Amino acid sequence: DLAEQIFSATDRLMAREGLNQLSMLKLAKEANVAAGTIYLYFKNKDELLEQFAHRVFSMFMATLEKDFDETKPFFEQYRQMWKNIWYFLQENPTILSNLKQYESLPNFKDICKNIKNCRWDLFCHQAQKAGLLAELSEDILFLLSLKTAINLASDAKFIDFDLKPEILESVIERSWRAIQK
Amino acid sequence: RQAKTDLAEQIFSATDRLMAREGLNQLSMLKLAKEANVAAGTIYLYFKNKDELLEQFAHRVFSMFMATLEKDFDETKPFFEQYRQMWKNIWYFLQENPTILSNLKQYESLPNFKDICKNIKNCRWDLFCHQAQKAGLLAELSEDILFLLSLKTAINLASDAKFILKPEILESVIERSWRAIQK
Ligand SMILES: [Cl-]
DSSP: OHHHHHHHHHHHHHHHSOGGGOOHHHHHHHTTSOHHHHHHHOSSHHHHHHHHHHHHHHHHHHHHHTTOOTTSOHHHHHHHHHHHHHHHHHHOHHHHHHHHHHTTSTTHHHHHHTOOSOHHHHHHHHHHHTTOBOSSOHHHHHHHTTHHHHHHOSHHHHHHHHHOHHHHHHHHHHHHHTTBO | OTTHHHHHHHHHHHHHHHHHHSOSTTOOHHHHHHHHTOOHHHHHHHSSSHHHHHHHHHHHHHHHHHHHHHTTOOTTSOHHHHHHHHHHHHHHHHHHOHHHHHHHHHHTTSTTTTTTTTTOTTOHHHHHHHHHHHHTOBOSSOHHHHHHHTTHHHHHHHHHHHHOOOHHHHHHHHHHHHHTTBO
């Protein structure tokens, strides 16, 4: 509500000026609220940025869950998560531009590590258990595979893949190919 | 006679450091001269202002990347080994130069990491793709897509090594990222 307004303002301000240039006064300006109002919702910049990081990971998990179907073949589960990332990034240009900056958020590593049993980690376990995937760690598998969606995400490549979906399917299958046992 | 290139590199080296420790936004010429151990006069003579500095720095950054791809290149080896060399070149370069690794993200804000990049005459990657495609080895996908499916892993692994390792694992990634771009 007012919190998402402020988080959304954090993205924009983080995209337009650096993460280093954020202040509670500036964020209040950018969210079109008085300086007092922002402090009603967060005690300080650290807390705001902590909760912001948590909102970012919450979106990431949302994206991995959308139209999840465990009855489908593992490839089609993978294809679905790849497309969810793709289309999420198409729809959210400020988030796309800010992806690299999020790694500098103070709470980012500490939040990232403490997520047990997320949708990707479970997919890798099931898929390894069925004999499909390489016995490599889940991080390395991600980097060889779903990460290609983040790697490729740009405006010119949204246009190209929508015109030639053959290319998008090729990239999905090839990125899957990389993590086959 | 170019002690002028060496002095430029003295300043560029310092640009990296001040960019890695403080932000790119917080750069100013006074701060970069102190870091480089050059007089205020020297840096202002070399570069018209902060803009012209960061332009030339960009070009210098593209050059180091191109030189990294070229190191130990050998047409006579198989295309996989050429690719494996390039992977290792990137991996060990970024591990040896972590200050460069930090600034990778912030580099795209430089004028012009768009313009100066697309405009690269005879890039080793491009050339390699052409020879390997001509031989029949690689997917018929554009050179950037092929990169983003393959060598890109070297950069992503170095970068996320910090936020998340044995030699068999590195070879697995080299071989598997290669696998993604095979015809
Ligand atoms: Cl900054």
